[PDB]
Specification:
The complex is a heterotetramer, with two copies of chain A (8 residues) and two copies of chain B.
Chain A: no helix or strand
Chain B: H1 2-12, H2 16-28, H3 35-62, H4 66-98, H5 105-123, H6 129-152, H7 158-173, H8 178-191, H9 198-212
Helix pairs in contact in B: 1-2, 2-3, 3-4, 4-5, 5-6, 5-7, 6-7, 7-8, 7-9, 8-9
The chains are: A little secondary structure (8), B mainly alpha (213).
Organism (chain B): Saccharomyces cerevisiae (strain ATCC 204508 / S288c) (Baker's yeast)
Modified residues (Phosphoserine) (chain B): 77
Family (chain B): Belongs to the 14-3-3 family.
């Protein structure tokens, strides 16, 4: 549920 | 040159396993990469490893008959072996060619952030001394990148910000350190209070802070 | 691994989004002596449809890139590497369809379902071939559809989702492969009108699936008649 | 482009 790095 | 053209082609076709193989030959040569190939290699491995992590996270959550439990545990080992091989291939590229032959501090932070990333993906499924060693290997690459990022990159730079995101996430997910995760996520977000990507970064930092607090 | 064990791994690979392994789980089941159940051949259909779906999408992207130096060739061999994978998938499904599935099929509904797949993956082949392979794919595709259509009209109610889904794909074949909008609309409109008349034959379990395919028929009818 | 049978 944690966000790591992506294109946006 | 021609190997970089096939990577852009395979990215349009979304055949990312071939994008890795073509970008692998561009990194196998010990010549320094470029800002484009540096990100072509990153997105290629991000998508290939992202599909298996998706399947691993879905299949592991499916476990909720002893034969049926031991059946999906063998299916997860199939995905884990792919997760291990793809991570080992990109880590051996970084540890042998990209990180040693990096000249600029900007690339050094990007490559050391990549190393901690795929070590962290290893910690997501490894067990025993495989997870313990992967935990230490990820924090060492992250801490090295943060020491270099604090001097070579400005606080608003997206590579310095994206590194803080994946570093804080590593604290909350692998080492189970909510205080360390929130501290850096907020320190990096506050230090950037002042291009077209840093805004999205701090968005992810704020959303992670909201969930973690 | 036993027969029921391969079916469970296919359902496992389905939700894991690993559809290439879903084929091997179902390919080692359809070749067994048993006839595929209503849900079994659904996994077989769902598996291959996703395996070839990715290459169809991948081929359609690489074609438009070329349709818009050494770059001219680099795309041509890349576009052909996908066409080889598209043929391998179609030849793999059509081989088991012609060796075990269709021969060992006894149910009238089973024959329509498998003969429809034969028309489907022959049509995927004719989507990209040119010359002899396109003419051969077009003929076998129409021959399998017509066979399915004749068996479906006598053994299946006109509202059955397999009978309606067949005419949907058969009509798409006329418009896209044979380039005959008059033949597509005629078959698609008739398939809609046949199901409208016998609305009482709409089963309880097959109700939602039948209404959905009928809307897909009308969407195509509107597009083809512009 | 026409629409064919999707997953049921």
């Amino acid at each position: 549920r944690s966000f790591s790095l992506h294109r946006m | 040159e021609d190997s970089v053209y096939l990577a852009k082609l395979a990215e349009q076709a979304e055949r990312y396993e071939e994008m890795v193989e073509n970008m692998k030959t561009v990194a196998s040569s010990g010549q320094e990469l470029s800002v484009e190939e540096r990100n072509l290699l990153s997105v290629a491995y991000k998508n290939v490893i992202g599909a298996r992590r998706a399947s691993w996270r879905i299949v592991s959550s499916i476990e909720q008959s002893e034969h049926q439990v031991e059946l999906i545990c063998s299916y997860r080992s199939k995905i884990e072996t792919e997760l291990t091989k793809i991570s080992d291939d990109i880590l051996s590229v970084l540890d042998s060619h990209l990180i040693p032959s990096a000249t600029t501090g900007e690339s050094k932070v990007f490559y050391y952030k990549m190393k901690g990333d795929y070590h962290r993906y290893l910690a997501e499924f490894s067990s025993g001394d495989a997870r313990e060693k992967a935990t230490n290997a990820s924090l060492e690459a992250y801490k090295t990148a943060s020491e270099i990022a604090t001097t070579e990159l400005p606080p608003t730079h997206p590579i310095r910000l994206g590194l803080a995101l994946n570093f804080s996430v590593f604290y909350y997910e692998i080492q189970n350190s909510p205080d360390k995760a929130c501290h850096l996520a907020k320190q990096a977000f506050d230090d950037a209070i002042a291009y077209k990507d840093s805004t999205l970064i701090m968005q992810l930092l704020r959303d992670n802070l909201t969930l973690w607090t």
